[PDB]
Amino acid sequence: MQTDLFYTMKAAGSGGSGGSGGSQDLYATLDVPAPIAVVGGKVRAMTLEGPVEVAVPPRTQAGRKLRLKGKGFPGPAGRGDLYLEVRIT
Numbered sequence: 001m002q003t004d005l006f007y008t009m010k011a012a013g014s015g016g017s018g019g020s021g022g023s024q025d026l027y028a029t030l031d032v033p034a035p036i037a038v039v040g041g042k043v044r045a046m047t048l049e050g051p052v053e054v055a056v057p058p059r060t061q062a063g064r065k066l067r068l069k070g071k072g073f074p075g076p077a078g079r080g081d082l083y084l085e086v087r088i089t
Contacts, residue, residue: 005055007066007084012040012057014065021076030066030084032056037088047071047082054084062088 010017018025032043040058044051048071057066064086072080 002049003052006068006071007054007057009067011066012059012064014067016065017067018077018081024072024075024077024080026072026080026082028068028082028084030054030086032060032086032088034088037061037086045071045082045084048073056086060086060088062086 007014026048028046030043030045036043036056037060038058040056040060042053042055045054045068047068054068066084066086068082068084070079071082074080
């Protein structure tokens with residue numbers, strides 16, 4: 001299928017990358033319940049290519065910025081990234 005995973009590099013403890021150059025990167029909202037965030041299950045992430053079943057990292061707390069490669073526009077890095085706003089419900 002279209003992909004597997006993206007933020008397996010940095011998700012639970014991303015720190016921060018970018019914030020300069022062209023506006024390649026994007027913003028989305030990732031809806032996740034408390035136990036799927038704790039264990040790291042799955043949720044649906046909405047991107048430029050439509051929906052993707054993205055496997056949540058372990059020990060995710062509300063406000064983490066997950067990073068989906070190729071789901072932003074090509075620019076400074078050549079590949080824009082989609083910043084997922086994790087929402088614990």
